Design a protein around this ligand. Sequence first.
Ligand SMILES: CCCCCCCCCCCCCCCCCC(=O)OC[C@H](COP(=O)([O-])OC[C@H](O)COP(=O)([O-])OC[C@H](COC(=O)CCCCCCCCCCCCCCCCC)OC(=O)CCCCCCCCCCCCCCCCC)OC(=O)CCCCCCCCCCCCCCCCC
Ligand SMILES: CCCCCCCCCCCCCCCCCC(=O)OC[C@H](COP(=O)([O-])OCC[N+](C)(C)C)OC(=O)CCCCCCCCCCCCCCCCC
Ligand SMILES: CCCCCCCCCCCCCCCCCC(=O)OC[C@H](COP(=O)(O)OCCN)OC(=O)CCCCCCCCCCCCCCCCC
Ligand SMILES: *C(=O)CCCCCCCCCCCCC
Lengths: 171, 122, 128, 79, 55, 65, 459, 87, 62, 177, 165, 155
Amino acid sequence: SWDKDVYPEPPRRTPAPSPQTSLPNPITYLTKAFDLLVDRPVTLVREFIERQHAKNKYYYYHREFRRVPDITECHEKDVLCMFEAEMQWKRDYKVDQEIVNIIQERLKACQQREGESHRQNCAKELQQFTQVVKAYQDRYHDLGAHYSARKCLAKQKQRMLAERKATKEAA
Amino acid sequence: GAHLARRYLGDASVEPEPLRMPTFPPDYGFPERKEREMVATQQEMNDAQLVLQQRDYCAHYLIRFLKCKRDSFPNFLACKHEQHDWDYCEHLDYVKRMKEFERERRLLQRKKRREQREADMA
Amino acid sequence: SFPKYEPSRLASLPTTLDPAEYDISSETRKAQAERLAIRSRLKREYQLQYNDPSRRGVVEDPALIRWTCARSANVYPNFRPNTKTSLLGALFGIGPLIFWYYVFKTDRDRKEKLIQEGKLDRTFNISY
Amino acid sequence: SKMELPDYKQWKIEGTPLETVQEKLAARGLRDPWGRNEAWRYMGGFANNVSFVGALLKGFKWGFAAFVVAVGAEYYLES
Amino acid sequence: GFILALEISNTTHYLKFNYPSNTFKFSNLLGYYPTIMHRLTPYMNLTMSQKSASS
Amino acid sequence: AHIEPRYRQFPQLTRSQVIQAEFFSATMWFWILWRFWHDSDAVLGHFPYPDPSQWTDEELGIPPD
Amino acid sequence: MLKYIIPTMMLMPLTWLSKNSMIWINTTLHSLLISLTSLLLLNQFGDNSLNFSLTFFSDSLSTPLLILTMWLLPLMLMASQHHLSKENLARKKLFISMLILLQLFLIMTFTATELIFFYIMFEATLVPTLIIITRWGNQTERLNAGLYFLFYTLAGSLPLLVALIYIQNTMGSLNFLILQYWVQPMPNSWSNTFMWLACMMAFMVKMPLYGLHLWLPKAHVEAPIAGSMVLAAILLKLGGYGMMRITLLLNPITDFMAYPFIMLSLWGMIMTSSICLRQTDLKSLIAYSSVSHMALVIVAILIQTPWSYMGATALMIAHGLTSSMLFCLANSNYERVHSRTMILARGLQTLLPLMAAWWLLASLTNLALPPSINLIGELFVVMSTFSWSNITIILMGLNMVITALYSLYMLITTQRGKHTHHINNILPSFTRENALMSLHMLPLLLLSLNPKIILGPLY
Amino acid sequence: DAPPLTLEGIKDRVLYVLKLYDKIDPEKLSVNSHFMKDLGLDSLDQVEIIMAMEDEFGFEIPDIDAEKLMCPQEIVDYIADKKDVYE
Amino acid sequence: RHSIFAFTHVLIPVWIIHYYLKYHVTTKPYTIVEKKPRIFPGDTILETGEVIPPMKEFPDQH
Amino acid sequence: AFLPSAAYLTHQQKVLQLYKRALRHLESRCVHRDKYRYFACLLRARFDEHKNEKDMVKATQLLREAEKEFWHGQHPQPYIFPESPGGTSYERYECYKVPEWCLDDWHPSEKAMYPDYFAKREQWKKLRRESWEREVKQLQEETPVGGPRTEALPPARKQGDLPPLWWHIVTRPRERP
Amino acid sequence: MLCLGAMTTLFTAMCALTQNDIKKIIAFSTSSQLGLMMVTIGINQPHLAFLHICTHAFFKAMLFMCSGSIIHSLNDEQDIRKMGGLFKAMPFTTTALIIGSLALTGMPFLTGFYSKDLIIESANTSYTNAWALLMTLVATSFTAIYSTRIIFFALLGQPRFPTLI
Amino acid sequence: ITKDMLPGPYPKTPEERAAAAKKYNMRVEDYEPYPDDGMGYGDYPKLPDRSQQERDPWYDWDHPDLRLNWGEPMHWDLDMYIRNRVDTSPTPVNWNLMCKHLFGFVAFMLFMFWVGETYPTYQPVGPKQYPYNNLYLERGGDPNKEPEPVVHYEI
Ligand SMILES: CCCCCCCCCCCCCCCCCC(=O)OC[C@H](COP(=O)([O-])OC[C@H](O)COP(=O)([O-])OC[C@H](COC(=O)CCCCCCCCCCCCCCCCC)OC(=O)CCCCCCCCCCCCCCCCC)OC(=O)CCCCCCCCCCCCCCCCC
Ligand SMILES: CCCCCCCCCCCCCCCCCC(=O)OC[C@H](COP(=O)([O-])OCC[N+](C)(C)C)OC(=O)CCCCCCCCCCCCCCCCC
Ligand SMILES: CCCCCCCCCCCCCCCCCC(=O)OC[C@H](COP(=O)(O)OCCN)OC(=O)CCCCCCCCCCCCCCCCC
Ligand SMILES: *C(=O)CCCCCCCCCCCCC
């Protein structure tokens, strides 16, 4: 399974089946046939496979990268420090890519789940998507195919000079 | 389709433009004109997942018809009454829109007679 | 009377509406007979090799080899740089390069000028 | 295997529109030498084909009968 | 449409031979569209594919 | 036995193709007449179309000046 | 990378000590073993390239080209062993030695950490290719084709030698890993303009650029089949590899130096594709189609966006497999009719149905049928060029019409229609030939299942 | 579907179409009755006979072959050769 | 062996696809995302028991 | 115009071919059989009117304006027979017409499936290869100097000889393989 | 979409009025129906267009199957001017061709009535390009014209096919 | 094949023209070369620029699909004038009349679509009326802001 906080679903409210006609629908009989013929043998096979899993339990681990100094506190043309800064920046860039992918999945799942009233009932996912796309665009857009932490730092410093000039002219 | 010939081949100053009307106030000619009553709650037609074209002033019959259409499955021919109720109230809404159109055309005739009377009087 | 057929480059004149089709003159008889003789000699030269049991391969066609050699290798040894070829090589060789250069250059100057003025709607554009 | 062709003497153009064609040709001094070749198309089972409203109303009689029976069935069955 | 085309179909049995109009030749030769566009547009490409670009 | 080819004459018909063709033609006309008997408004009209010129100025609010 | 260099060198005593009936089987077997071993290079990371030593390194750009290079050698040995059957034994071993030497030069061309060693290997690949074309080519024009192939390349590459030694004297190094971190911006000057031309024009010739492509419809045509396979599938891609290594150092001047050359490809891929509509020579049609496909790679490297580099490296790998299979199909008909004229042998689906199925599959991969990696590279380049300038879709989309129109014409002229009557030596498809077609097509179809390995260092 | 033609069946059909032609008396006609010499017909009549053969058997005879089929046996042999009868 | 087509081509694929969707696809988030079911005035929720209140009384038109 | 045996069409041949093309296009215009039969006898009368014209310039002129008549009165989509050029089924089965020499390339395990057929093919191939030299020396002893004049071929003049250049006419594929 | 669909459904149904190959006539029929589908997308009725797809599939595949039955029964003959008299000779194909032609033209309460007629009722009663509606109606008349052209030359009248049945 | 049967330079003397015509297997009176403007044709014959569809289909060709004989001098654009490609066959209607009719029909239809767009048909009705301020929250309006009250009355 997954975490319901990073992949949120609201609680499901299905209505009770209230038949008006006396004609029995084929869907309930086919659901009973799918329970007998399909779901129970698959369940038995998965229980067998899971017992064979439980006979030999072992683990893997999620790798933790400790934070090395970034590109701002590396001396210029010092490859032993700015190498580590660049590798850390590439891993942060790949993780930010996956964050934007998570928010896209949230947005698309909200659209399909809310169905016809999706424009009203998915304003929060749209707003979080807009914020994270704005942040990703201000951070990594237009760096080129030869992007680096130096390119990203230069873009950030250009944006900060533009913001400082815009603040100074508005005072 | 005579109104197309009246607007295109006649004059268009007395004929109402479809894209921008009513150009007259809704109280212009009415003592205490009451609003249209919306039966279905906004949350009710929100939770019925109706199309936004279908969330008009007569969607409560549509909610009744869709609940009938769900509850009477597989007998798909068993909700003609609720369908005719919704179709009749959509018909009444269409008659109201025709009444708005004819009201605007008659008030443009009134304004035409007003300006001709003001030109002939003074 | 009847509308005369006006032949074009891609819609040629019919065989029956050509006024040279009805030539009974002896020089046209000689030309048609000599073309018949050439065609019959080439036909006989083909189908002697085509009907050979000992032959197993390709009846080579020097007309075909001649056509491919004219289309491929004979073009430069029979080229002369003159007025016509120079104007056609400048018109068709560097002309479209200049044209697409100015089109794409004007488009990218307009787009870059809109982007660095904060005018282009680049709201969700993060794949590039 | 061996197929027997029918007689050639049974194809006569009298009573067919080939007769009208031959009469309008003899009205201006002509004669129709391929009439008996075309005579089989207007004779036999391929004579008297239906009209277009008879083509559309194929099976209309039994359909109308089944309609009246079903309307009477639902008119009695409501009671 | 059925009535007008039944009239057109019943006139086919008649012994009247007219020359075809430009309306018939326009409806029958596919609005003249594949007769033009499939002769002209490949020509203008393929000559340009040999005289201009290749040779 | 399969159909033998014939020459310049009407071909052999099976009983089955004739009765099935007539049965589906009768099925078509039964369905057309049945649905025309029951629905009768998808063709001829569902609701009456009101005349706007017959409406009073009182219900549309046209004060006489 | 020495675990691949030494087996490739041990292929030389493997072919010079084999018995006279055994020199194809042993080299095919052990070159397939080297190609199996090549998959260990897929130890790639999301941040760090696989950096073996001071001399050799392999990122996710060099790795698919290495796998394709080490896979192409057994396929060239299968393709070339039929028409060299009556060849002298020692000349047969010299041919195999030139192919082995070319693989050896290529697998340390792509892994060269330092750029002048890249240049030495990059220009060392000329000599076996030149010898294969001019010695085992079939016609008279192999000598002129060897002269054109040598002298466009050297006229391009000797300013690259001067420019790389200039970078060595200025930056202090030509290590690519050092130059990732010490790269200085290249401003606008005439000195930097000719710096850019000297760094780029060699790879422009090797791609080839339109207008500089003239060596290719001779060198790809006059070569034997192993020569055409290695020229189309690998040796064009040295230009794109070297561009992706060298445009790191050429910023930001590239953003206005790319403008003529982008035009030269965006119009040129319209022209050469149009040229493929009127090619009577089938092998020349495949050559001009290779120019047409590499023009998109030139545009994608010059516009230098991530989608463009991913589509460019996908299109390089996909075009390597596709054009190699197309030349092998053209040779499979040349070994029967002994003429490269496409209109000669027609209606071959009536005579060779399974080979016509291979023709169909290679045509569909040539016209970028989804979800093949031909379409993946094609599509990503089209996305990045639309983001570059929106009008370019016209020159993209029109290209994708003409790219279909010669691919199926090649399928219709050769395989469909009435068969030629006077040609009667059309043997059935040999097992070697169908094996060759499958060893091209089946990796090209399996790479659609996992395309992330052929999408470069910035996937 | 597609019943196989034989020489006897083609001969029967060709002579049958020629017995329904009102410029040939059906008692003088045989398999070798030459149309211009024995039956005394016009070249226009020979063209109409070959066109009736085309409408009978359903395939066009070209004019370079139509202007040389001058007896019914030649027509039967031509239809035989162009349809490969007695396989 | 009379209805082996309903066993090999249908029922064994229903087994394979149900196992694949139950224990590999629905165990990952947002892979099978279903539209939430339609709720009417007068319904009873299965997961809550909360009766949806019916609509307001109609201004009857006929 | 373009014929294998003759270099040209005679005037009489041109009149016959115009007559046949006019009747086919008339049948395309005049769909029903009685109506076509009426207008076809009328067209036969129009061709019978100028049958006995002795001035060859006048007959050639009448043929020329009759061609212009036909070109104005042609059908835009004339009726084409299905196996006629321009037909719907024209050259449809050419993908199924495999030549005979491909049977030589078969494997002996798939030749052993038909023992009598290939045993009978061997005497056809033997008859062809013993007739070939006799028919080549027949062609060279009968062709005039300067090459052949027409594309016609002589028949087998002797007993035991086969006609020259006969193999790819006799062993052509069937129309429905 | 509205102008393009009305242009297509005019032009192809106009071209179908005078064709003689039966498969060409039914191909112009299906392209005229696709033009009608593009029209009813252009009037903001996508679900009626999809209903017309699902409706159109049945009778148009059946009309091509009836044409193929005729073509195979007449030995690969595809031209309507060599047909006729097949009302009784091919009775089941006659029945199904009449039912398909009436479903195409919009006979009431056959399958084509349940989308196409509604399409017309939505193309009339909408803020529409009026020339597109008028060409849509001219195309609707042309559908009846070429449908009874099929029925008249193929099924009605007298035989025109060759003599070996 | 050898040297003197390959294509060569443009013939100027009549004996060179006659040797060229003998090389291309055709009569001297029928042998026209391309005009010597230096485009790269040389002595190659200008065949009369017809498609291969116009060739006689009932004639027994050496190549029946191409309608082309063995040894026959091929057209320069033979790969272009194949029957899978560009046709030059005579059309029942004149080419200029076809172009005028098609351009007139397309231009008139586009003009009438422009006219009908300028003058659209509609129904004698008002606007469709929606509750809750023309469905403000449904159309994506934010709930923190408040729209102006859109009110519809009975009529
Ligand atoms: C890792 C495990 C992977 C397992 C799955 C496999 C994944 C793909 C691998 C490669 C698949 C193709 C190989 C077979 C075809 C090539 C040879 C051939 O033609 O044989 C005909 C022959 C049958 O014909 P025949 O009657 O005997 O004689 C042939 C006739 O002479 C004449 O024959 P013909 O002309 O009548 O018929 C030829 C016909 C021609 O058919 C066509 O032209 C139609 C195909 C194109 C249009 C339709 C498809 C469009 C794309 C959609 C499909 C892909 C995505 C689908 C998923 C949903 C959407 C995302 O070919 C087919 O129908 C082949 C069906 C499969 C086509 C796949 C796509 C090829 C089209 C071009 C590229 C398209 C983009 C890339 C797609 C890549 C997908 C992975 O086949 C065989 O005998 C099979 C040989 C063995 C096949 C082995 C396959 C695996 C190879 C890899 C080995 C190593 C990994 C282990 C896997 C083992 C699996 C068992
Ligand atoms: C395939 C055929 C075409 C191939 C094209 C190859 C590229 C075309 C351009 C090459 C120019 C020559 C090499 C330039 C190397 C630049 C290195 C460098 O640092 O430059 C900056 C240096 C600058 O000097 P510096 O760097 O020492 O000075 C310090 C910096 N400043 C200038 C600020 C003080 O440039 C030069 O010194 C000169 C560069 C231009 C050289 C012009 C001569 C050659 C002309 C073009 C020849 C093209 C090929 C000819 C053959 C064709 C076939 C026969
Ligand atoms: C919503 C917007 C809607 C816009 C609509 C209007 C715009 C498009 C206008 C029409 C353009 C396409 C039509 C013209 C080209 C048609 C080519 C073709 O199919 O030719 C067929 C021809 C032979 O076929 P045919 O003679 O008909 O067959 C009779 C049976 N023997 O076959 C041949 O001769 C073979 C030829 C092969 C090579 C073809 C070379 C020409 C390629 C043209 C590509 C055009 C690309 C345009 C790109 C636009 C980008 C925006
Ligand atoms: C006014 O007439 C409103 C109707 C829409 C414009 C006119 C439409 C005319 C075509 C439809 C009716 C056809 C009657 C034969």
